[PDB]
Amino acid sequence: MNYETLLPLQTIREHAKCDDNPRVTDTLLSLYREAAFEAAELYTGMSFTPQKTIVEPVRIKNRKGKIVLSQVPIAGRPVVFTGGGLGSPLELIPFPNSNVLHFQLMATYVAGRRCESSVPAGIIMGVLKLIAWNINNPGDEIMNNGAVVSGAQDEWFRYRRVIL
Amino acid sequence: MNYETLLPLQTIREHAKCDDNPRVTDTLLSLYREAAFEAAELYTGMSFTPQKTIVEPVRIKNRKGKIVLSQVPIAGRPVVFTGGGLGSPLELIPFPNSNVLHFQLMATYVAGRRCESSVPAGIIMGVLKLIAWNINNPGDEIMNNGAVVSGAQDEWFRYRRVIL
Amino acid sequence: MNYETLLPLQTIREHAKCDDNPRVTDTLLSLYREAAFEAAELYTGMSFTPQKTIVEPVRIKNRKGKIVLSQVPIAGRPVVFTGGGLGSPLELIPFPNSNVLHFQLMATYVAGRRCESSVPAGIIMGVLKLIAWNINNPGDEIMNNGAVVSGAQDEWFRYRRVIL
Amino acid sequence: MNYETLLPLQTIREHAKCDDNPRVTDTLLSLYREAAFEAAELYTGMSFTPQKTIVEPVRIKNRKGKIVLSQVPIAGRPVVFTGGGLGSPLELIPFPNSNVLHFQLMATYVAGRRCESSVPAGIIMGVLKLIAWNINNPGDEIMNNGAVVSGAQDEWFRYRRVIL
Amino acid sequence: MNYETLLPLQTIREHAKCDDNPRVTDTLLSLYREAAFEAAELYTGMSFTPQKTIVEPVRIKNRKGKIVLSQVPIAGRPVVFTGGGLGSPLELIPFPNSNVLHFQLMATYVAGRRCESSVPAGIIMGVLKLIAWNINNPGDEIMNNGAVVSGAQDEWFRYRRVIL
Amino acid sequence: MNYETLLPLQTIREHAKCDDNPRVTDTLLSLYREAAFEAAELYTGMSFTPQKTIVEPVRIKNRKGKIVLSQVPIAGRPVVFTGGGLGSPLELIPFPNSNVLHFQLMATYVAGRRCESSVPAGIIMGVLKLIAWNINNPGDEIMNNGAVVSGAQDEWFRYRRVIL
Amino acid sequence: MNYETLLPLQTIREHAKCDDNPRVTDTLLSLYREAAFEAAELYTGMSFTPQKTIVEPVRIKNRKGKIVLSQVPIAGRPVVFTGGGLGSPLELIPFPNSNVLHFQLMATYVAGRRCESSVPAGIIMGVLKLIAWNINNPGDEIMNNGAVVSGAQDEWFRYRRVIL
Amino acid sequence: MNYETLLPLQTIREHAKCDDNPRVTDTLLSLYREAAFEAAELYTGMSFTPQKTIVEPVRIKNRKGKIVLSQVPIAGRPVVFTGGGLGSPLELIPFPNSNVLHFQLMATYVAGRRCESSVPAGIIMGVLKLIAWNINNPGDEIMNNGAVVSGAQDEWFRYRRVIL
Amino acid sequence: MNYETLLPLQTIREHAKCDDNPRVTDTLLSLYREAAFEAAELYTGMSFTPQKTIVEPVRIKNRKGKIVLSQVPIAGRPVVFTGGGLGSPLELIPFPNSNVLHFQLMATYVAGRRCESSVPAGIIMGVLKLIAWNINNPGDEIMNNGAVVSGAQDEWFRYRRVIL
Amino acid sequence: MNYETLLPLQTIREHAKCDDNPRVTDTLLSLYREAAFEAAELYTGMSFTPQKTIVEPVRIKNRKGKIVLSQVPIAGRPVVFTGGGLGSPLELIPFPNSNVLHFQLMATYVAGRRCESSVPAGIIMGVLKLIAWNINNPGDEIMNNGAVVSGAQDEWFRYRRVIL
Amino acid sequence: MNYETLLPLQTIREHAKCDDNPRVTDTLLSLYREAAFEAAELYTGMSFTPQKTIVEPVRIKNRKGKIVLSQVPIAGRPVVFTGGGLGSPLELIPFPNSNVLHFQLMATYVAGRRCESSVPAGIIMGVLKLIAWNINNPGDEIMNNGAVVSGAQDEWFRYRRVIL
Amino acid sequence: MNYETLLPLQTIREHAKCDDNPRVTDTLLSLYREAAFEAAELYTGMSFTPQKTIVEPVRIKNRKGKIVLSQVPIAGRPVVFTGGGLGSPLELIPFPNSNVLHFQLMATYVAGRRCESSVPAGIIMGVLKLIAWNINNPGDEIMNNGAVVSGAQDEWFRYRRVIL
């Protein structure tokens, strides 16, 4: 993917205060950038521009009618349901920024984002901190996890929406 | 967005005493300003300039007749109800600084600000400290939770409406 | 408000001992003073001469008829209420230094305080301390609220009279 | 108030050893002196030389007839109570350092001092220490509760008269 | 009062290691002396040479007929008590150094000292210690109460005589 | 495996900045790389990517019919079951990220990774960190659990996925 | 007084190694000596040379007839009792070594010491140590309870041997 | 066994960074390597190629017939039992990786393994650390066991089969 | 008593490494020795040669007739009792090393030793330590008793070994 | 005995880097070697090369035939019982690695080692460390339990085997 | 006593490094030696030089017939008891190193070896250490119970014979 | 005894590493050697070459027949006891190293060692450490028993065989 557009090398170099470097090659930094983006993906679950189709074997959690989805659905668009003898389609309006719906069973929806320009800035701010840490810690001495001490995880934490 | 009118780059540079450093280009300051304003909006809950129309579904929270909405409406404009098979749309005056309801189903309101001069000074003061912190410490050393240690977050606490 | 009449910049400079600062211009010091006065007013509640009006809906609290408004009405002319089923409004005299009144219903009033020169010395001293602290702390600390550590909030405490 | 008679500027300048310093103008010293005397008045609760005479409502605390005063009446001559259905005005003499009298209801008496030289020296000594602290520490360092650490709020404690 | 005879300036200067001081003027030392004497009087209640007339309303303490007074009357000359239902005036001489007597009402008496020479040396030593402390602590340095750390209060403690 | 394709020696030499060092020959770097990759494989349990469908033995765990598989099936391609006493084919949709299925026994499903570039960058970062630690610390000092203190172990914890 | 014969100034100066010092006059040293002997008398309770006849009131302590006087007795002149139910002074013989009388009412005895020579060496040593402490430390630094820390007090403890 | 085939001495010299040692000759490095491989074998239990025959007596264990042999037979080749008054010898196939069989008696068997090529990398890495630790600690410094502190025993732990 | 016969000054000057002192004259050292020997006598209870007579009254103790005298009579010579309404005087033999006898009553006796020969060695060492401590602690050192910290009271303890 | 064939002096000197030191003669090194081997034999319990026949009395520790013997028997030769009124001497096979068997009375056996080449390397390493410690620490300082702090003891622990 | 035969001054001078120091004359060293030997005798209760014969009274401890001696006799010749109703000789020999015998009463005995070699070297060793401590530390410093910190009272503990 | 053969002076000097001493004479080291050997004697209880006879009474312990002796009799020749048993005096040979036997009563026997060459090396190693410790510390510095910190007691501990 064109990570260059999401975060240029020049900005990374400027933030890290490493635009005068005798041995750190761009080829290596292009690996740290991808690693940081993958780490953010794993920590938050918010995919970038490439949208992904979701069809999964949903289930009912309890008699209250609670259904848990694996990922948040595309915002605004209703979500459809089918299967279990219900030949006709069925759909409801989902909650924004949530993955709980109410009435073998089957359901479908799409997850992803419009494009490079819709990424919240806080994600980038945490990512840049993570790259800076990885640049200034090849792994020779202790001076304990990298993604936490660098503070990027705290920046990303604002979006993980723990129960209120 | 016109973040420039809210906090011109000149003031940010003057506060940080870095107007002559070529290491901090305009784009980096723009990114820092955007991230700081986003963090302030998330923390204090005060929606910024845009006046976005908001529509989202609801479920009857309790048997007593309580329902909750996700964002704060602007005072004056009633919150209206539509759909859900009910008798007919209904209009309610919003309780300022609250989004709780008193008597699938739908409702909608507006959130935002009419004028940009209404920004309290404390928010700008905290944003200045946060940007100053981000300019100096890239997070690659331990001597990193900028929002807390920089002191910006505590300034905004005056408005986070602790329960009296 | 004309804060310059209450605290000349020269006085602030003589207090903080910053009559030679090589980078702190007056345009930033004025913002500092504005923020400090806002913080003091919010903490103590001793507002100034200018006035503002508000309108809100209200709900009775108990069978005894105690009612709570969102802001303190001016110490003076009546506070008006409208609606409530009855065909004509009802009005009560608001008790000063309080937001509580005694008996949907809509309420309106005007906010503000009395003559300009009401400011005592302690608040001025606290504001000076807060400004002095703010000048010498753009935010860097491993060696945490500015108003608490600086001691200003201990100067203003004499006017709160907390009953637990 | 006319503090010039109670504590000449010359004594303050001599105690703090700043008579040759041009960076502390008469305005700033006047502000510090006024603030210090205000703090002393708030802490110990004795109004100074001006022979203030008070008229305050009083209600019997309990069936035993205890009545508590908000100020200590001048010793040696009676304190009078009126109103409250009394057949005729009645006046007694209080026990010294006692603010409680016992065998609508209104009470009046005179509280003050004859000559300014009777202003107890401890109060002036505490004011001097507070002013000296204020002049040297603007409040932007951690080497700030001036009233305490300087000792003035301890020098004044002799008078507050906790219950024996 | 004749403080110059109770404790001359020369002795105070010699004790505190002062041959000649660059800025400490005698006028300020004269204030320190008076402050120290007032502090001693407040801590012990032992009024100096000027004998004082005392009149106050006395009461009986307990079932045992115990009687207490505000100050110790002179050792050998009676106290008087009349009014409040007494049958005839009667004056009696109290215990030595103990304000305890045994079987509105007003009682008066005289307390004080025979002459200047009656002052025990310990009080003078404590006053000298307190003066020395005050000369070397204008109130600007922390790294607390002056009268205790200086040790004068410990010297005076020998005469307060808490119950045995 | 042919590790030369996964991680060329050039990248290791660049990250550890030892391309000009003649004391670390290719033979020793091969050993270090092999050991690091084997350690990662043992830890996360994700054998690397010769693309491979999965068919493995299983035995039922309890009356509920729960059966535990080894690796995560891919999304959108149903598993199929055989073995035991079954006489007809059967296919069920797997739950995302799951490794347990319920209705000797046989069954096969499609999973794994296709291209070597899909090897998540986190694993490569962990391997690089472990190799960098091994290069500089032979293991005879206390200023030695290399996998942990170097942080390589922490980078691999994102995958082991303790029960939710 | 006779303090000169008990402890000549020459010995004190020799002990304190300050004979050639013009910075401590004779009057101040005499004051130190007087204070030292006063403190010693208070602590150890041994009345010094000046004999005094004592006449003090007494109250019956208990139903057993016990009565306690104020000061320690010297070998003791007989005691005459007056007041109460006795028409003429009731003569009786007291006993030394205890302050208890056991077969308003008056009692009497004598106390003191005939000669200086019996002052034990321990008292002199303690007085010397206390005077040496007082000469050097004026009481304005901390790193000040002279009677205790100087070690003088512990020397005198040999003679008390309290019974608890 | 031919340890020089598994780990060339030059490899050890390169790992420990001792390619200039002034007094560590090869006749001692051979002993160090011999000891380290023996320690690894005892810890992990993975033997080395050469086989050896063993004969031992046994004692009747219990009813269920679980019998423990002092060593692990090789590859499950038959293990014979003789003597003890049995009618004729009986033989069983021993379960590999264990020394327990299911049924005075005598037992004999042979122990060993197949080939050198089946040595994983982790064991080699641990042995290298153990040798490096041994070289630089001849036994005259305190800075508890060599195999533990050096971290070698933390490399072999991956094969010791804790109970899942 | 003639201490010079028991301990020459030269012995002190040799022990305390003070055979060069130009400030510690012999007159003060003699007083030090005089005090030290008296302190040793008080601690050990072995009164010295100078004999002294004593006369005292005694109260009636109890049924068993054990009576306590204020001092220890001289061993082996009668102790007399008189007065107390007895028909004629009664005399008893006093038990040595004690002040208790077995039966207002008056009592008389005498105490002392024979001569100076009754001094063991350890007492001399204790006295030497006490004197050496006293010389080099004039009483202005804190950067706690003299006789205990010096160890002399640990030398004399051997002669008590009481049943404590 | 011929300790030379087990550990030549040349190897010890090479390990301790003292081959050119004339301060350590051959006799001292022989003494150190003998002491170290004795300590190892005592600790690990492995009887060394010189074979010896042992005859000692026994008393069964329980009531069901528990035999216990002082030292471990050597493999092959049965332990033979003699005397004790037996019908005839009886022979038992030695259970390896133990001296407790299932059955005044007498028993005998033989212990030792067939050849010197059977010494494990770990014993030699521990002996070398202990000798190195003893060479460089005579035991007159504290930074002295050589067997433990030198690390030699822990090397031998591999063989001591715990009771399970 | 004639200590010259037990420990010549030459040995003390050689051990205590002071064989050329003129300060420590013969008298002071003899005093130290005598004090140390007396302390040793007190601690151990064992007179060294004379083979003293003791006659002491004995009272039966309890009906068991236990008698406790004060000294330890020798194994081989008896200890005699006399007095009471014994009409025939009665003398026994106790357990070695035991001071208790199992059956007014009088006892006497003598034991020990021929010569001064019964003054074990340990006692002399302790005396040397105590004298060495005494010579160097007069007791006016802190870094003082010499008998302990020097180890002499620990050296003598071997013979104290804890009461088993 | 000719200790020279047991441990030559030269070996002691070489071990304690002091063959340059300017003041430690051989005569004093000869005393140190004897003291160390006595200390070993007292600690472990094993006598040296001189075998000695023992005579003492032996009271039975319990009905089980357990009897104990002061020292271990020679390993192979009998202890004797007269009377207290069957018709003839009887002597038996004891357990190896265990002073426990089983069936007036005076019993005697011999104990000791064959020759000077039978002393285990560990005893010599401990004695050398104790000698070095005694040489280093004459008793002045404190840097707590001398026989333990030296480590000799730990070396001797292996032979003291605590009770099981």
TrEMBL record, chains A, B, C, D, E, F, G, H, I, J, K, L:
Name recorded for this polypeptide: Structural protein
Lineage: Viruses, Duplodnaviria, Heunggongvirae, Uroviricota, Caudoviricetes
